[PDB]
Structure formats: C-alpha cells, structure tokens
C-alpha cells in the first residue's frame, strides 16, 4: 500500500505500484511498474512539485468451468500514487512512454529549483 | 524469491514473478507478471506436468549526472520460475501471449488427466 | 482526540470529530461529524491550505430526580479540528451544509494547484 | 459494535451508536447518537423492558473524478441496538425526538416499577 | 464504586458504601455504612426485588488559614447503591433505622418468595 | 490496616479507620470515620505531639434463622490509631465531637509550634 | 465453595457439597453429597425455581491424648447451597431421600415449564 | 486421586476418598469419606502397619427421558486407598463402623509400637 | 530539553523553559517561563513564522563556607528555544513584557494568515 | 508535587516549586523558584527547624477568541512547601528577597545548632 | 512448621521448636529449644527409633489497658515433634534435663545399631 | 538478624532474639526470648526511650566422637537488641525477671509520656 | 547512512559523512567531514534553502602480495548528502574551503530570513 | 556517594569515604578513610548528636608528556559526610587523630545518654 | 572509543579514529582517518611491534552570535591509538604521509618476521 | 577484588586497592591507595614488565565494652596486586613514596621499550 513514507519526498496511495525516482541536474525521471494495465487507462497529472499516477487494471476473468487454484497476483482494480517530488518541475514540457507495462516520465526542473555550483578555494 | 511453496503444486525459482494458475476442465492457464521484460528474452519450456519460464530484464541504466534517490523496483536481472502443474499437459498444442508485461499460457490437458464424471443415485 | 495524525495531510485538535477528506480534480470536500451541535455554534474558517472547525455542544442537562445510569457519549463541550489540506483552496468561493449532524464543506482549488495532464506517446 | 455489555442492563447490536441512559423516578430517557441518518430511516420499537433502535445511513457517494484520500467515518450501513431497560415501561405513551443527529426517547415507567419510599425512624 | 458485581444478587452504583445483606426465613436485612451523612439526606426506595439507597454527604469545609495535610476520606458527595435482592419483598411494611452512621433496613418477604419445607423420608 | 504510612507524619494501628488531618495556624483538627461505634466505647488520649484513638464496634449479631449471604463490612472488633502529629499540642484545652460516626478533635497548638511570619523586602 | 457458577442455572453457597442436576421431561432430580451429616440436621427448602439445602456436620471430636496427624477432610461446620433451577417446580409434591450420605430430591415440574412437542413436516 | 503423598505416612490409590488419621496413645483411628457406597461393597483389609480400603459405588442411573444437565459428582466406580500407618497395629482386634457415608476404623497399636515415657530430672 | 516536539508546530532547543502558545484570530501569544533570568539577558528574535528566545541565567554563587546540601534547580546557564509558529507574523509590530520571570510575547498575524469565515447555508 | 523526599531533610507539599538549600556555618539559605507569583501572594513562616512557603499563582486568562493550542506550563494554582531544616533557626532575624520569580530566604542558625570545631593532634 | 523434611531422617510436627541432633558412638543426644514452657507441660516418649516431644506454653496474657504493639514471638500454644532417629535407641535408659528453656535428651543406642569398625589393609 | 525494622519504633542488633513489646497506660512491658542463656550473662541497660539487651549463649559443645548430624539451632554466640521505645521510661524503677529463658522487663513511663484523656461532648 | 533525520532540518543521503550546522545571525555555516576525498572530486551545489554535497573517494588499492587484515574504514565510494537548511541562503555569494579533509561552507542568509529583534518593555 | 542510608543512624554526603562507627559504654568512636587527603584540609565539626567531616584531596597532576592509561581512583575533589550519631556527645572534650589516611575521632557521651543498669531478680 | 579489541592484534585508545591495517610480504601499511587534525599536531611513535598515534584536533570555535544547531561531529580534543602489530617492524626506516586528513604509515618488517616459503611435494 | 581485567595490561589480586597507571615517554608511574597500612607492612617487587604490591593492614581492634554498630570498612587483612605493565622497566632505578596512605612508584622504562619518532613528509 505504501500508505505513508517520507525520506524528504512523499509517496501515498493504494495498491501495488513500485516506483523509482531518478534525479538529474536538469530533470527528474519517474519509473512506474504497471503490468496488465492498458495505455488508455492511465491518468498522468503533475503540477508544482507533485505528480499523480492513476491506473485501473481489468480483473482476471474466468469461465464457470475454470477456477483459480493458486494466485499471487493482487486483485485490486483501481490503483494510484501521489508523489511529492524534491524539485519543482515544468509540467508543460513533460513526456511519457509506456512499454511492457513500464511507465517512464521525464519531468524537466523549473529554473527556481536548478542548483548553482559553489567554487571551493 | 518464493524459494519453496507447496499446496499440492510446486513453484520454485529466483526473482520477482507473481503467478496465477487457472484450471479448466480441458486446459490449464498460467498467468505470469513480467513487466519490463522484452518478448525476445523469454524462454518458455514445458514437458509432462512441469513448466519452466526464464526471463531477463535489463537493469535501469542512468547517466553519470543522474542518480537514483528512491527505488522500490527490484534490481535482479535474471528471473525464472519452475512450476509443477497438477495435470499432465500436451506441450505440442500449447500457446502463449505477451501483452503489457503479462504472459498468458494456455496448456491443453492430456487425455490421461481429464477427469470423468460420476453419477449420483 | 486525534491530537496528531499525518498522512501527508495534518489533523490536530481536541475532542471527538471524525473527518473524511475527498479530493476531486477541481475541489476538495471535507465531511465532519458533529452530532448534538447546533448550526449557530460552528465556527468555520479557512485560508491558504488550512481549515479550522470549531464547535460547542451543550452538556446533557438533567433534572434533580433524574440521574445518568449509563453513558457512552463523551462529555467534553469545546471541540475543534485544524486540517492542513493537500492543495491551496479559494476560501472566498467555499460553501458548507449542515444536515443531521453532518457538516459538508466544498472547497474549490486554487489555479496553482489544479494539475495539468501529460500525454503519453 | 458493543456486541455485549452488562451493568445490570444489556446492550447488543452492530455498528457505531453511542447511547446514554437516564433514569428518573417516573420515566427513563434514552439518548442515541445517529449522525447522518435520515428521520424516515429509523425504526423505533419497544415492549416490556426492551427497546430496539434500527437505522440505516446512506453511503458516502462520490463522483468518478473524486476519491477518498482520508476517512475516519465508519462505512457500515445497517446499524441497530437492543437495550434491556432496568424497569418495565409503558410503550403506548412513549415519545421521541430527532434533532442534529441525536435521538431522545422518553419511556414512562409502568406502575409495577415505580419504587415507593421507606420512612426512617 | 462497585459499578457491577453479581453473585446471584446485583449491586451497582457510585461511591463508597459497604453493604451487608442478611437473609432470614421471612425477611431480608440490609446494613449500609453511611458515616458523615445526615438522616434527612437519605432517599430510600424499594419495589419488587430491588432497593435503592441514595445519599449525599457534605464536603469537609475548611477555613482559609486551614489546609488538609493528610486525607484518607473520600471526597465524593453523591453516593448511591441499587441492590437487586434475591427475593420479592413487601415494601409497604419495611422499616429503617439510622444510628452512628449505620443504616439498617428490614424488608419482609412476599408470600410468593417464602420457601416451603420438604420432608425427607 | 494502614500498618505504616509516613509523609512527615506517622499513622500506625490496626483496623479500618480513615483519618483526615487539618492544620491551621493555631490548631490541628483530626477527623476519624467510626461508623457503628458507640460514643462510650471511644478512648481518646493525647500528649505532646501524639494522639491515640481506641474504639470497639459490636459485631453484627444475627438470629439462627438469619444468615449473611453478602457482606462488604469488615468484621474486626477492636480498632485503634496512633498518630504522630506535626506539632506539639495543648491536650488540656482539646475538645472532641462525635456525630453520625464521625469524630472531630480540635487540638490547640503549643506556643513553641506556632510559626512566626517573615517579611519580604 | 462454588461461590458463583452459571450455565443457565446458578449455584451459590459455602462449603463442600458436590451436586448433580438431572432433567427429565416431567421432573428435576437433584443429587447432593452430604457425608457425615445427620438426617435431622438438613434443612431443605424450595419455592418457584430455587432450592435451598442447608446442613451442619459435627466436628471431628478427639480425646486429649489423641491428635490429628493427617487430615484431608474439610473442617467447616455450616454448609449450604442455593440452586436456581431451569424450570418452575411444584414444591408441595416434592420428595427427598437420604441414604449413605447422599441426598436425592425429586422436584416435579410446573405445567408452565413442561415443553410441548413440535411436529416436523 | 491422591496418586502419591508422603508425610512419613503413605497414601496411594485411585478415586475420591478423603481420609483423616488420628493417633492416640494406644490406638489409631482412620476416618474415610465414602458417600454413596453401600456397606456390603466395602472391602476392609489390614496387616502389620498397612491398611487397604476398597469400595465400589454404583453409577448414577438415569431413564432414557432423563439427562444430566449439571454434575460435580465424580463418575469413577472402583475406588481404593492403601495407607502405610506410622505404627504396627493388631488387626485381629480392629473394628469398623459405617454411618452416613463415613467409615471409622479403630486399630489398636502393637506392644512394640506403644511409646514409653522418659522422666525429666 | 524538549529537543523535538511537533503537533503541527515545532519546538526545539536546550534547557528548561516551559512554553505556552495562545492563538487568537488576529495574533499569537507566546508565554515563556524564565525564572532567575535578568531582563537584559534575553535576546528575542522573530521572522516569518519562527521565533527565537535566548536567555542566560547566572549560576547560584556560594561562599566557600557555604555548600549546597539539596538542589532541584537546574544548573545549565545558556538556554534557548526555536518555535515554528502556525501563522506568518508581523515582527515589526510585536511587543514583549517580562514580569516575575515570565515573558509574554504578542505577535500580530500577517494578512495572508488571517483566516476568513465560510458561511453555512 | 514532591509529595515526599528525604535525604535527612524533609520536603512536602503540592505543586511545582524547585528548591535549593544552602547551609553555611552560621545560617541556612533557601532558594525557591516561584515564576508568575506576585510578591503579595507569598506567606512565609518559620519556627524551630521547619519553614513553610505558601504561594498562589493566577491562572492564565484568555479572551473568548483566544485558545491555548500548546502548553507545557502547569495549571495548578495553590502551591506550598514545608521544609524540615537540618538546624534550628532564629526566625526573628530572618529576611527574604524576591527577584525575577526567585525567592531567597536567609535563616540564621540558633546557638544550640552552630557546630564547634575539633582540633586534630 | 517443618511439615516435611528428609535427609535420611524425618522430623514432623506443628509449631516452633528448633532441634539439634548429636550422634555419638554409643548414644544419640537431642537438644530442643523450649522457651516459655513449664517443665511439667512436657510429655517425652520414645520407642524404637522414634521420639515424641510434646509441650504447651501459656499464651502472653495482657490486661485490658495493655496492648501488644509489636510481637515477633509466635502465638501457637500446642507444639510437638516426632523424630525418626537414624538408630534404634534404648528408651528405658534415657534421661532428660530442662534448663533455661532448653531440653537435653540422652538416648543410648541399641546393640543392633552400634557400628563395628572395619580394618583397612 | 532484624538489621533494621521500623513501625514507628526501632529494633536493631544481631542474632536470634524474639521480642514482644506491651504498652499499658502507665508502663511498658518487654518480653524477650533468650533460650540457652545463663542469668549471669545478660546485660540490661536503659535510658530515656531506648533499651539495650545484651546476652551471650555458650556454643553447643560436642565430644570428638560426637558429631552434629542435624541442627536448626543458630550458632551465633553474642546477641543483642537495641529498642527505641515509643515513650520515655523511668529506668530507676525498672525491674526484670528471667524464667525458662524468658526475660520480662517492666518500664514505668515518665510523667511527660503519660497521655491525658480528652472528653467528648 | 543517516537515511533520515529531522530536527526541523532534513539530512538525507548515503555513506559516511558527519555534518555540523552552525547558525549565525547573518549566515549559516556547514561543516562536513570528507577524509580521503580529493578537492577536485567534490561537487557542491545549493539553491533556495537546500544544499547538496557530492563526493567520491578512491578505494584502498593493494598489491597482490598485500592483503587487508583489519579495517574499520568504510568501503563505499560514492557518498552524498542533501541538507534542507532552516533559512533561505544566497548561493551566489557562498564560499567553501577544504583543509585536512574538512569542508567548511559559508552560506549568507537571504534578507527574508534575517530575524529582527523585538524590544521588551 | 552514599547519598542516603539509615539503620537508625544517618549518613549523608558526596564522594568516597568509608566509615565505621564504634559505640562504647561512655563514648563513640568514628573511623573515616581519607587516603590522599592532607591533615590541614580536614574540617571536623560536631554538636549535639551530629558530626560533620569535610575534606579536599588534590587531583592527580600529570606532566604534558604523561597520560593516564588506566585509573580506578575516583576523581572527585570535595568530599564530606554528615553523621547523625545514636547518642548526644560532648564536643568540647572530643579528640581526633590522622594516621596513614585514617581519621579516628573519640567522642565522649553526654550524661543524659549514658545508660544505667537494670538489676534482674 | 575502541577501548579494547583483539583479533590477534590489539587496538586501544580514546576517541574517533578508524584504522585499516594492510600486511604485505615485506612491510605493514597502517591507514588512519584523522580529519581536521593539523600535520604538526600528530605524534607518531613506534618500537618493536607496537605503534602509537597521538593527535589533537582544535575544537569548533564559534562567535557569540553563532550557535551550533546540529552536530554529528564528536567534540573530544585529545585522541590516541595504540596498535600491537602482528610483526616486529624496523622503525628507523618507517615513513608516513598525511593527505586530506588521512595518515598512511609504511612499516618495513624486521628480518625475524619475514616468513619463508614451504615447498609442497 | 579485580580478579582479572585486561585492556592490554593485566591487574589481578585479592582485596581493595584502587590503582592508577600513568605512562610517560621515559617512565611509568603507579599510584596505589593503601589507607590504614603501615609503611613497614608493604612489600614492593618488580621485574621485567610486572610489578607486585603486597600489604597487610591491622584489623580494627575494639575493647570488650565497645562494639561496631555500623561499618563500611572492609575487613580483609592481606591484600595484593599483580600488574603486567605495558613496557619493560628498569627495576634497579625505581623509587617509591608513601604519604597519607598513597603509594607512588616511579618506574623508568628500559631502552628497548622507549619509542622512537617517525617523521612525516
């Protein structure tokens, strides 16, 4: 569930969705694992320093003669994550790809969040 | 890891791969979650009543300016599962599909494993 | 009491007042349970991203021949909750209803907190 | 739930309903907290020395864009309480009021349950 | 407090009041310890098989120069006990005495509760 | 029993006797709870800074048809308390009252124990 | 002692007295173990649905040269049991026998407690 | 059961049989509680310094309409006790009585076990 | 020390200084206990929503013949507290008083932090 | 509270008042922390070897719009301490000062309590 | 009590009586502590390898004005000890002395219990 | 040992010596158990409110052929007790008796310790 | 690692790097321990109120004949810390020195974070 | 430290100082262990029944090349003990010796504390 | 501190100093982490098979307006380590370097500690 | 006792003797606390790297009228310590002083244990 976790950055929501966050100097990359979710069932929103991923996977349909004798796959349908990013992003230049059940989001940092170098004497 | 689990049927192997087993009257359906795995990197073998799934997902490559500040995604590359099925299957008529990181295997039962009905008086 | 609770959003105060928070795309709805509280005894304030609900319920008055032989109802009079919302709201367009001891607050989001959609390629 | 509680008087039933019992010399007052319940959805019955309160509150309906990010309010719909009173009441003269989610029941005692004073010499 | 205690006979109420119950063949004697309570501050009621004793003792008044440096005496004012007797009593013939802070109540049994002897052969 | 208790002042003895000690500027008041004790059965002695209270209450006599089915009242007969007071008293001017099982003793302080005020500049 | 025990039927009292209760269709049989008790020292009373057994056994008398070097036999003298029966009995038709230290009581049920059969279709 | 107990004297056997042992100067008295045992069902044996008591009580017979709804009475049938006495007895002069389910055995001491007095100077 | 405490508002620092925070509609009052601290030894700073109180009390000086045989007074010299307030304050209109070792700070709220009322229909 | 503490010298009373005791060769100094207490509300008494400090601090008054959102300051009003000193003092030469909420009492020793030096050979 | 203790030799009885046993080559000496026991109240018997000491000390009598404020002395009246000796004694040649509450018994060993020396080669 | 014990009165010392203290209206009686102690080996001293009893009992001497196979008797030689009495005694009128190892001391109270009666109105 | 620590200021990152933060009136000083890190391998960035220190120390290289028989030095290569400062800094005027493996960063506060003094009346 | 210890006699103070107390018939001897303390640094005072020992030992001085690699010696400098003696002493006739770090004090008893002998009849 | 640790080689001392030991065939390399220590404040000594490193780092000096709000850096000044090496070294050919707070010592082994190879057949 | 303790240096022996060890560059100083020990009763030996201190203090002699009512001083007579020093000493140049029960030993280091400095480049 990951109902609440904070290491300077916040992740909340319900359901199974592993998430990796990659911080470059000029942008932030977010990788989300969404297996079994169609591309048209993903709502991707962002403003400021927060990003919302919403998805719905169809449940495992079976015939009446068929029955599930073993299952490790979670049965929840509606899953979502709200991520408070460490930097303010420019959401109008963001892009996303979805291949093999993996969502990759590129978020460019705002100019107020790009750090400037300090020279050491 | 799921190193060992037995409910009359055995699953062994290393890595993250949730698996659902669906038993019909004439066939067995196996659903495996493989997000981020290419279709050409999956080795699928079966004989008798055992089925082997082998897969390798590429690790998350990063540039030198980029760094992973948060990650829930497992980092193992080579994953596999060996499943001892409850029935003997005909592997020459088996089929498989791969959509959105989900592998679906249809295994037709052998004629020696199809159960016959008993009438109640 | 709910003296302190944080799931990315903060709730503080004293006394019994269950609260549900519903987040839409354009607004935030807050539902508060205030049974036995008159409509004129509720102070409702909001600015920025924080909302304060103050209420006072009259104590259970009894005649001198009467006595309380059993009571599960809490006896505190002054109750309040301070809620730090996840989004900045427009408090000049907020509305509230009070029916059957249930307070329902509609808070429209500010334009800096309405998230914009990202297209997936 | 208050599945069972006995202090000479019994309370059973399912769901959240705080109850205070006030005993006078000639009557018994029962106060029940029913927030969010309409007046027409309350069934109130009494005979002998037992009183039954039944209620159903409507579930919190949401639009498809809306979602519940926080909730302390219990989600059960059908709630009821059965109260065994300490005295036999006259149910044909009982009255009830419902204001701000609070139900107040006045139960007049039967003449066989009104206690008579003993003079001290 | 003795809020609830049952050994076939029930005692409930609030405050400090030791009670002895003496059962004869034709009557029931109840002894209550009420030190510091005036005779006019005792309400004694009975019907059927239940007896109610209500009392209020005045608090220990002190001058402003005086202070309580040690106290084992309880500070509650209103005390009461409700006793469910093992037999139905005739409350119209009951009597009570109060000497040296001790209340003694004589309750004659009803004819339906006086037990009849069984002869052994 | 209160076998031993010390808060700068000592109480010893056997049996049930709650005691409150009240210290004024010029005197010490001692309140003892003795319900069921006759006035003629109390021996009250004092010298220096110690006071002795001795009492005997008669046991609860019953007829042979009567029996005690419940009793919270203690059954000890001889009770006493020895109290080491915080100040030296004048025992020749002491007085005592006994009403409703409550003994009130007024002990005037000796002139060597009356404290003198210190002025603050 | 069996001070309190309830399985729909109550047993209270002091001392050693094992009791078996046998319920027929028309009567209730009570078996009590009273070894060492004379027949004339047993008081047996019943009314309604409660039965009282009272007994006194003589203490084990010894000469002054004699001494008790071992004893498992309880030393209490006055023993009694109060039994709340599951049915209302007719105490005017009750009978009792006492053989070998065993008391057997036959209590005929009242007509209001004799159950009637329900036919199954 | 008292399967084994030793305080210089031994008691073994199976079942419920309380036993008191009384030692005089010239004899030993043994009191055994055997309620519900007929006089003809008691086997009493003794030799040297050991005594054996054997008894069988009939089980509680019930009609087919009757059933046991409560029972504290033990259900074992064959009971016995073997007692190693502290002194050698003369078993040819022993006597026994059985009244009200109580067995009383008088065992005269042998001349080798009668202790002789020592004079103090 | 109160090294860290958070109820939506933060208190940090070292040493003994009890602090009460009072929130009005237009201002925030902070009460600090500083016994033994001179008025000239208090540094009081505030900006935004944080307030810093710094103080130094002189240590308890003793002559060489004198010694401290008992002491509950803490011995630390430099004490400070940093308080993150719930509202943005106007530090240019703040005032402070110091009487009897008690510091009282009045902080007027900024106009962006004064909450506006929501009308209920 | 410091209800009881003994290190050869006794401190009793109720409320928060840290106390340091300084023993010189000719006098005893007592330092008490009384923040928020007015100078006119302190009663200071001493005789023999005991000293009594009594104080009352006014409660923290608030306007109806104001509320206490955080408080570490204790809310008790009447505080006092009784101190049994290690030496007999001359109370007619005692003096006291009160600055910044700190009370300082100088108690000169009696001539019977001033220790005399022993020469070492 | 010393209810049971075995180091190859047995001591039983009730009450406080310390005993030392001294074994010589030809006799056994038994020392018993009997303070407060008269010389005429001691019954001393022996046969074979067992010795019985019986004593009764008078209880501590007090006048009605006197009371026992402290007591370590045991209050039991009848005391006795049965000692199973390691050797068979000749009770017809035994002697005893009683001085200062100490009983000293000389028991000559029988000829069947005097051990014979074994020569070592 | 009784190294330290305080119930308002103090007992210290080393060794086994049970002591009873009896307080009358005019005197104090002390009973000490000293078995095996000669009359000439007791040192008895008293002043003020403290009493010292010193005694030495001879050790249990044995021949070289003799040995102690069992011993409950304590082996310490020098025993003493110091008793701080509750009242000041007149040691010049004290008397003592020593019979059967029991020392009885009569200590008359000083006139400053004899308590005077207080009349109750 | 210091994975997460919050005292109003946040420290996150991986590896061994002790950090001290010193707050003046006009600036913030950050001291970081980086032993074994070259000056050219330190990336120092800051914006707003957050500061990032990145470093890589070369691993301890050994010849093939050499081996590490003991090591307390951590073996990680890439270390970093992200520090959320309590005040907004001016990163364009920041300076840094690196001496003896110690990094000292001087961060001037922004004018919006410099606190203003409050005068006490 | 020996902060508090009471065996009828009190020892208080700070630091390491073992003390033996020897009570004669006419005097009290006090032995104190003061190793490393000069004779001129000991303040010895006594009055009534209390004795004060004050001492200061110089700390272990080391050269800058020297360092302490092991130390069991306590490092406190100022040590003192206050002893409440069991008897009133005459401080004008007291003497003291100091050899090898051992202080021996001879305190002659006052005439009011010298006990008088009681004759036994 | 590493007060004592032994794995065939000993490390003792006080303070924070991580140490790695590298053993070659002909020499021993010791790496010590000393950040913030000047080169002139390091005393480096060796003889036989033991090496001593002594260092003093200056404490973190602050101006009076500055204060340390967070610190993980240890505050001890004098640090040292004594290392018992596994081999005897030649201290006259030893060398040391100090770069970036890291001390590297090269100790050539003595000829008695250089191991000789054993050929395997 | 300090039976065994090792921090690279060993201390063994029996009895109370605190010891401090001081290591210079050229010598070792040993400080031993021996209060109450005469100068002629100390045996001081050393060879190689081990030092032995042996001492005997005379026991505390008392007159027959005197007794020890309190004692913290240990009663052992023969005390010794064996110390394995960290360096080889020259025992022919050692010296020792004994003042106020403190033994101070100066042990010059051998030339094989004096460490030589290593220069840092």
Curated annotation (Swiss-Prot), chains A, B, C, D, E, F, G, H, I, J, K, L, M, N, O, P:
Biological processes per GO annotation: protein complex oligomerization; protein folding; protein stabilization; response to heat; response to hydrogen peroxide; response to salt stress
UniProt main location, coarse: cytoplasm
Location within or outside the cell: Cytoplasm
Residue stretches making up the sHSP domain: 10-121
Keywords, alphabetical: Chaperone, Cytoplasm, Stress response
Signal peptide: none
UniProt GO MF annotations: identical protein binding; protein folding chaperone; unfolded protein binding
Subunit structure: Homooligomer of 24 subunits. Forms a spherical shape.
Domain of life, per lineage: Archaea
Main function: Chaperone that confers thermal protection to other proteins.
Protein known as: Small heat shock protein HSP16.5
An example Gene Ontology CC term for this record: protein-containing complex
Lineage summary: Archaea, Methanobacteriati, Methanobacteriota, Methanomada group, Methanococci
S-S pairs: none
């Amino acid at each position: 569930t990951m109902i609440q976790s904070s290491t300077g950055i916040q992740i909340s929501g319900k359901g199974f969705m592993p998430i990796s966050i990659i911080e470059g100097d000029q942008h932030i990359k977010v990788i989300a694992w969404l297996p079994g979710v169609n591309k048209e069932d993903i709502i991707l929103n962002a403003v400021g320093d927060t990003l919302e991923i919403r998805a719905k996977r169809s449940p495992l349909m079976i015939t009446e003669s068929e029955r599930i004798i073993y299952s490790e796959i979670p049965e929840e349908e509606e899953i979502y994550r709200t991520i408070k990013l460490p930097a303010t992003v420019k959401e109008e230049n963001a892009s996303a790809k979805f291949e093999n059940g993996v969502l990759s989001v590129i978020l460019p940092k705002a100019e107020s969040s790009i750090k400037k170098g300090i020279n050491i004497e």
